Design a protein around this motif. Structure first.
Motif, PDB file in Angstrom:
ATOM      1  N   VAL A 102      -4.047  -6.649 -18.914  1.00  0.00           N
ATOM      2  CA  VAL A 102      -2.839  -6.963 -19.652  1.00  0.00           C
ATOM      3  C   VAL A 102      -2.893  -6.254 -20.977  1.00  0.00           C
ATOM      4  N   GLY A 103      -1.749  -5.767 -21.431  1.00  0.00           N
ATOM      5  CA  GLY A 103      -1.710  -5.040 -22.683  1.00  0.00           C
ATOM      6  C   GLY A 103      -0.292  -4.644 -23.043  1.00  0.00           C
ATOM      7  N   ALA A 104      -0.154  -3.931 -24.146  1.00  0.00           N
ATOM      8  CA  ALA A 104       1.154  -3.515 -24.599  1.00  0.00           C
ATOM      9  C   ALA A 104       0.991  -2.391 -25.610  1.00  0.00           C
ATOM     10  N   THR A 105       1.990  -1.517 -25.669  1.00  0.00           N
ATOM     11  CA  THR A 105       2.074  -0.516 -26.716  1.00  0.00           C
ATOM     12  C   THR A 105       3.398  -0.703 -27.433  1.00  0.00           C
ATOM     13  N   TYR A 106       3.376  -0.673 -28.759  1.00  0.00           N
ATOM     14  CA  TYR A 106       4.620  -0.554 -29.491  1.00  0.00           C
ATOM     15  C   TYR A 106       4.771   0.872 -30.007  1.00  0.00           C
ATOM     16  N   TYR A 107       5.941   1.453 -29.773  1.00  0.00           N
ATOM     17  CA  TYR A 107       6.260   2.777 -30.263  1.00  0.00           C
ATOM     18  C   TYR A 107       7.175   2.681 -31.446  1.00  0.00           C
ATOM     19  N   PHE A 108       6.643   2.969 -32.640  1.00  0.00           N
ATOM     20  CA  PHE A 108       7.459   2.999 -33.840  1.00  0.00           C
ATOM     21  C   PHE A 108       8.418   4.154 -33.686  1.00  0.00           C
ATOM     22  N   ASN A 109       7.885   5.276 -33.209  1.00  0.00           N
ATOM     23  CA  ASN A 109       8.693   6.399 -32.759  1.00  0.00           C
ATOM     24  C   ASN A 109       7.891   7.364 -31.878  1.00  0.00           C
ATOM     25  N   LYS A 110       8.383   8.582 -31.750  1.00  0.00           N
ATOM     26  CA  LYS A 110       7.715   9.539 -30.876  1.00  0.00           C
ATOM     27  C   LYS A 110       6.392  10.004 -31.492  1.00  0.00           C
ATOM     28  N   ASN A 111       6.188   9.684 -32.772  1.00  0.00           N
ATOM     29  CA  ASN A 111       4.983  10.107 -33.505  1.00  0.00           C
ATOM     30  C   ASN A 111       3.993   8.975 -33.807  1.00  0.00           C
ATOM     31  N   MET A 112       4.472   7.734 -33.859  1.00  0.00           N
ATOM     32  CA  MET A 112       3.607   6.620 -34.247  1.00  0.00           C
ATOM     33  C   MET A 112       3.637   5.468 -33.250  1.00  0.00           C
ATOM     34  N   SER A 113       2.468   4.897 -32.962  1.00  0.00           N
ATOM     35  CA  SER A 113       2.369   3.752 -32.060  1.00  0.00           C
ATOM     36  C   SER A 113       1.090   2.952 -32.270  1.00  0.00           C
ATOM     37  N   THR A 114       1.080   1.734 -31.747  1.00  0.00           N
ATOM     38  CA  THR A 114      -0.131   0.926 -31.726  1.00  0.00           C
ATOM     39  C   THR A 114      -0.215   0.222 -30.391  1.00  0.00           C
ATOM     40  N   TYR A 115      -1.413  -0.202 -30.011  1.00  0.00           N
ATOM     41  CA  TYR A 115      -1.550  -0.857 -28.726  1.00  0.00           C
ATOM     42  C   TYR A 115      -2.768  -1.749 -28.595  1.00  0.00           C
ATOM     43  N   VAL A 116      -2.636  -2.754 -27.736  1.00  0.00           N
ATOM     44  CA  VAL A 116      -3.743  -3.614 -27.375  1.00  0.00           C
ATOM     45  C   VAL A 116      -3.866  -3.508 -25.877  1.00  0.00           C
ATOM     46  N   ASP A 117      -5.100  -3.495 -25.391  1.00  0.00           N
ATOM     47  CA  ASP A 117      -5.362  -3.299 -23.981  1.00  0.00           C
ATOM     48  C   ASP A 117      -6.515  -4.214 -23.613  1.00  0.00           C
ATOM     49  N   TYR A 118      -6.258  -5.241 -22.809  1.00  0.00           N
ATOM     50  CA  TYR A 118      -7.316  -6.171 -22.481  1.00  0.00           C
ATOM     51  C   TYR A 118      -7.731  -6.027 -21.030  1.00  0.00           C
ATOM     52  N   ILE A 119      -9.034  -5.953 -20.808  1.00  0.00           N
ATOM     53  CA  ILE A 119      -9.547  -5.852 -19.453  1.00  0.00           C
ATOM     54  C   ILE A 119     -10.146  -7.159 -18.959  1.00  0.00           C
ATOM     55  N   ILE A 120      -9.450  -7.826 -18.053  1.00  0.00           N
ATOM     56  CA  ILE A 120      -9.998  -9.030 -17.457  1.00  0.00           C
ATOM     57  C   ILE A 120     -10.946  -8.587 -16.355  1.00  0.00           C
ATOM     58  N   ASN A 121     -12.202  -8.382 -16.750  1.00  0.00           N
ATOM     59  CA  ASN A 121     -13.204  -7.803 -15.861  1.00  0.00           C
ATOM     60  C   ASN A 121     -13.681  -8.793 -14.798  1.00  0.00           C
ATOM     61  N   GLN A 122     -13.490  -8.437 -13.529  1.00  0.00           N
ATOM     62  CA  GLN A 122     -13.828  -9.349 -12.434  1.00  0.00           C
ATOM     63  C   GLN A 122     -15.146  -8.990 -11.739  1.00  0.00           C
ATOM     64  N   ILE A 123     -15.826  -7.966 -12.224  1.00  0.00           N
ATOM     65  CA  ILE A 123     -17.147  -7.659 -11.693  1.00  0.00           C
ATOM     66  C   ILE A 123     -18.023  -8.862 -12.011  1.00  0.00           C
ATOM     67  N   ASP A 124     -18.825  -9.313 -11.057  1.00  0.00           N
ATOM     68  CA  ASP A 124     -19.598 -10.529 -11.289  1.00  0.00           C
ATOM     69  C   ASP A 124     -20.920 -10.194 -11.965  1.00  0.00           C
ATOM     70  N   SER A 125     -21.544 -11.214 -12.547  1.00  0.00           N
ATOM     71  CA  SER A 125     -22.801 -11.026 -13.258  1.00  0.00           C
ATOM     72  C   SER A 125     -23.936 -10.670 -12.304  1.00  0.00           C
ATOM     73  N   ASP A 126     -23.704 -10.841 -11.005  1.00  0.00           N
ATOM     74  CA  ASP A 126     -24.732 -10.539 -10.010  1.00  0.00           C
ATOM     75  C   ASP A 126     -24.611  -9.126  -9.415  1.00  0.00           C
ATOM     76  N   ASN A 127     -23.579  -8.390  -9.823  1.00  0.00           N
ATOM     77  CA  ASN A 127     -23.301  -7.073  -9.251  1.00  0.00           C
ATOM     78  C   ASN A 127     -24.557  -6.243  -8.969  1.00  0.00           C
ATOM     79  N   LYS A 128     -24.698  -5.824  -7.710  1.00  0.00           N
ATOM     80  CA  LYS A 128     -25.955  -5.243  -7.242  1.00  0.00           C
ATOM     81  C   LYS A 128     -26.346  -3.945  -7.927  1.00  0.00           C
TER      82      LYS A 128
END
Ligand SMILES: CCCCCCCC/C=C\CCCCCCCC(=O)OC[C@H](O)CO
Ligand SMILES: CCCCCCCC/C=C\CCCCCCCC(=O)OC[C@H](O)CO
Ligand SMILES: CCCCCCCC/C=C\CCCCCCCC(=O)OC[C@H](O)CO
Ligand SMILES: CCCCCCCC/C=C\CCCCCCCC(=O)OC[C@H](O)CO
Ligand SMILES: CCCCCCCC/C=C\CCCCCCCC(=O)OC[C@H](O)CO
Ligand SMILES: CCCCCCCC/C=C\CCCCCCCC(=O)OC[C@H](O)CO
Ligand SMILES: CCCCCCCC/C=C\CCCCCCCC(=O)OC[C@H](O)CO
Ligand SMILES: CCCCCCCC/C=C\CCCCCCCC(=O)OC[C@H](O)CO
Ligand SMILES: CCCCCCCC/C=C\CCCCCCCC(=O)OC[C@H](O)CO
Ligand SMILES: CCCCCCCC/C=C\CCCCCCCC(=O)OC[C@H](O)CO
Ligand SMILES: CCCCCCCC/C=C\CCCCCCCC(=O)OC[C@H](O)CO
Ligand SMILES: CCCCCCCC/C=C\CCCCCCCC(=O)OC[C@H](O)CO
Lengths: 340, 340, 340
Positions: free
Chosen positions: C297-323
């Motif tokens: 889940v995430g989002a980018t805001y575009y102030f314009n074609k030159n400026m932007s900001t963003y948050v990007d969250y990774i809900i990681n589903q790899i388990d702690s036991d991953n071989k």
């Protein structure tokens, strides 16, 4: 140079080529700045975009290309990005940028970092708040929210940078600066403090879990005159080396002073005189020891805004007995610069 | 491209992308130019500023970005700054620049360094006066103080560059060149001599404290024709390797000849023929041995001033028995170039 | 930005500065994207020249400058050229370019490589046809010779790149892609196969002489909506590491799926949701194992074609036991971007 200006976005592509040579006795190994070819170039861009009447976005990137390397195995020695940050500025509320940028204590140290080639000795790169450093978030305020002419302040968060050497590492920290300028006069204070990493704590030189840096400045910059002084102190922050034992670390305590005087004649000559002294205290095995100690005479001639040349002589006052093995010999730099 | 021209300062941002491949038998290990992807790009700026009616200032920086590396551990292989210098030019008096720049003997060797991809074999980088080299101060004079049409001369001081390898090092030296060009014809001579470093003197190949290089050129460049010859000799200057013993050094003596002939058809085809031979003498353990020996056939098509393609074939005449283990196989290069 | 347009040649100098930080628990060693400053900049040029009414020549070069390195010994970590190619385009016949460029299977994988910071997990650099790679010759065709609106196809030859690591190497191979786009809808297939080098065959993980990669895509890109899916499989192509044994190689077989959904509000907000899963099979000593497994889940805001900001969250589903010891923790990226 402004190579693009359209739709509220303006871009500055800049750079220079500097033919530069240092002269010092013998190897230059025992000298202030060393010896030999020191030629280099810079390339950078800085952009500014109008988002709306009150909001501007901006970014900048700056790189150093050494021009005193072969095209062989040392081709890359000393190349690096110097600045890389983007930010927003709103009305009189303030500005915020993140990236590789100047630590806030440089807001003070900038007063004296004005010499043609040398000077600004205590503004170390990757040294917490005194110089360029990575992962710094910086809030700046101009004229106190638009309420006070000439009063500026800044608050900065330094993210932890755990690198493979203690020299270039740092822990989390916070700093700020405040400055007031009125009709030629300038005064500034800045302070910063931060955690040290385990790697820094493991070095022979420097003892403590915290690092601290502060500095104050006074300057007069009216007409053709430039006068400025800095004073500052640091704890566990200033990087040092014992050449005798090949030991490395930080200085438990330093006290530094920087003075500069210059005059700009209208025909292009800018003579320069300066003094710099940085003392270290409580250095393990040494105690008190001068790190920097010199007078500077030099001059730059400006043919114009694009062309200049300069000579910069360091009357090095570090003695041949210096307990850390700091270089005792003089150094003179001569250079010719093209910039756009 | 001229991306900025204002207030007497003009700036040239240039560069190219070259899709390039070499074909040679097997590994290409035993071939003239090797085998595989050889793609690369260039970026540079050259600036020129009007200081006054008689005085111009200028600078230039040029970088090579290999495009045949991964984005991994070899990402940087073969990247370097090629040129980095700034200088002043006055009236008919002359010009002076300092920085990384072409050694003066290249003033002669330039005549034949005209092949699409190969050629210019004896113009080694970081090899005293024959090629690009760091810390060189160069005085140039055009048309003999404005008194003699077509007569130019140059005097150059080479600063000492003590590097971590003998290949890329050099001691102090002085060289000069003189050339006269009149209506299609060109003639040129250049000489350079310099001290060798202790590291160079410690190498198995090459014996002596001094290095010397000289070369003369004749050319005809009128209309669509290009013909040029070079002859030259060197002492303790030409870098060599014995692949059998994995020994490295410089050649005590070399004698070189370079010939080129080309024609430019108006529709864009430029066929090329060339010959190059570089012999070494008094090589320890070997004696006399060819370093380079080949014929070249090739051609470039110019779609325009921005786009071109070319094939360059090296009929390599080095024999399979070559005492130094110099590659004996042929090499052909094919390339497509975009430049601005 | 278009900084030069004259005589049928137009040049684009572009670049950005990205202030970027990743947040993940602890060291970030056990996380999806790690932890800390991740600031960087880009610089590139792309040129386009009119040779005649039917023939255009073009080139492009693109470089990455990390801005999260010190100015010291790690100054160069992660810097590289990303693209370097030149080519010609003729009428409706097609285009041909050579150099470092996107492998053809990226023609499919591009559908989902749309996330603000993460995503596009299976588009590995220097990994045959899935990503940027050196020495690729590429023929492209638009609208089937000008006969079929929206139908494109591409054929690509990959030259052998024998590097010092198996990760960044490859043998000769051929691939192609075909795509059809009509009024918002897009569908694409791509396949590639190539020889593996002896060094790759010598690695503990991955068994076979041939490498194969393919992928198909579906997308809807009308108005403010963006939806896309990818499916793909690989043999001996996907690079993997066993952190337990410190073993390295390629996955004998992988099956991957990528989904993305985004919406662009007119006021500048672009919310993003995504899913990615990459499974490996027949991994020596392990068998079946997830390589990537997460929601975004995430989002980018575009102030314009030159400026932007963003948050990007990774809900990681790899388990702690991953071989394989693949990181199991989440990662969130926050960034602010200036581009021209
Ligand atoms: C101009 C008109 C508005 C007032 C400006 C001065 C505010 C002064 C008092 C607060 C100063 C900072 C105190 C901490
Ligand atoms: C908004 C644009 C992105 C700003 C990111 C700021 C990171 C600041 C440093 C965080 C350091 C954490 C160290 C633990
Ligand atoms: C930013 C807010 C402080 C600005 C002034 C710092 C002055 C110099 C240092 C004064 C002593 C600090 C001692 C700890
Ligand atoms: C212009 C403002 C006035 C500058 C001169 C007086 C202060 C001079 C520096 C005094 C430093 C004292 C340090 C103890
Ligand atoms: C044109 C009018 C002025 C004279 C030009 C020729 C000077 C020729 C003699 C000196 C030539 C260089 C001698 C060393
Ligand atoms: C005027 C602009 C600066 C020129 C510097 C020239 C240095 C020339 C090389 C000096 C080498 C000394 C070697 C010992
Ligand atoms: C610059 C001034 C010399 C210019 C001519 C050099 C000619 C070739 C070399 C002639 C022999 C040199 C022998 C030492
Ligand atoms: C045009 C000027 C004349 C060129 C042809 C005669 C000299 C040809 C080169 C002679 C080289 C002799 C080397 C011994
Ligand atoms: C538009 C008018 C001309 C014909 C376009 C379609 C050709 C369709 C048949 C061939 C399609 C590719 C078959 C392989
Ligand atoms: C026309 C412009 C130049 C094109 C060169 C294409 C090389 C393609 C790869 C060749 C790889 C050979 C591998 C053996
Ligand atoms: C380019 C021409 C093929 C384009 C379509 C590839 C579809 C996906 C892969 C289908 C299965 C390939 C199995 C080998
Ligand atoms: C718009 C075109 C239609 C998209 C929806 C139907 C196919 C959906 C994907 C089906 C994938 C099946 C995989 C087995």
């Amino acid at each position: 140079a402004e190579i693009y200006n359209k739709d509220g976005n303006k871009v500055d592509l800049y750079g220079k080529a500097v033919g530069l040579h240092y002269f010092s006795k013998g190897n230059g190994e025992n000298s202030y700045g060393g010896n030999g070819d020191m030629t280099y170039a810079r390339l950078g861009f800085k952009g500014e975009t109008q988002i709306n009447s009150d909001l501007t976005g901006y970014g900048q990137w700056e790189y150093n290309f050494q021009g005193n390397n072969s095209e062989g195995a040392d081709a890359q020695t000393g190349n690096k990005t110097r600045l890389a940050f983007a930010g927003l500025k709103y009305a009189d509320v303030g500005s915020f940028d993140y990236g590789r940028n100047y630590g806030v204590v440089y807001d003070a140290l900038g007063y004296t970092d004005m010499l043609p080639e040398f000077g600004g000795d205590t503004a170390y790169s990757d040294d917490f708040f005194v110089g360029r450093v990575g992962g710094v978030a910086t809030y700046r305020n101009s004229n106190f929210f638009g309420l006070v002419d000439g009063l500026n302040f800044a608050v900065q968060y330094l993210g932890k940078n755990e690198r493979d050497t203690a020299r270039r590492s740092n822990g989390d920290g916070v700093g700020g600066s405040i400055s007031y300028e009125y009709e030629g006069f300038g005064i500034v204070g800045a302070y910063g403090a931060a955690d040290r990493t385990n790697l820094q704590e493991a070095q022979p030189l420097g003892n403590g879990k915290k690092a601290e840096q502060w500095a104050t400045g006074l300057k007069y910059d009216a007409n053709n005159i430039y006068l400025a002084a800095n004073y500052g102190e640091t704890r566990n922050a200033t990087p040092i080396t014992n050449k005798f034992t090949n030991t490395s670390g930080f200085a438990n305590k330093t006290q530094d002073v920087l003075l500069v005087a210059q005059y700009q004649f209208d025909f292009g000559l800018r003579p320069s005189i300066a003094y710099t002294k940085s003392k270290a205290k409580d250095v393990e095995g040494i105690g008190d020891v001068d790190l920097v100690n010199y007078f500077e005479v030099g001059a730059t001639y400006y043919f114009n805004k694009n062309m200049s040349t300069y000579v910069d002589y360091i009357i090095n006052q570090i003695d041949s007995d210096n307990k850390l093995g700091v270089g005792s010999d003089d150094t003179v730099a001569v250079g010719i610069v093209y910039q756009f």
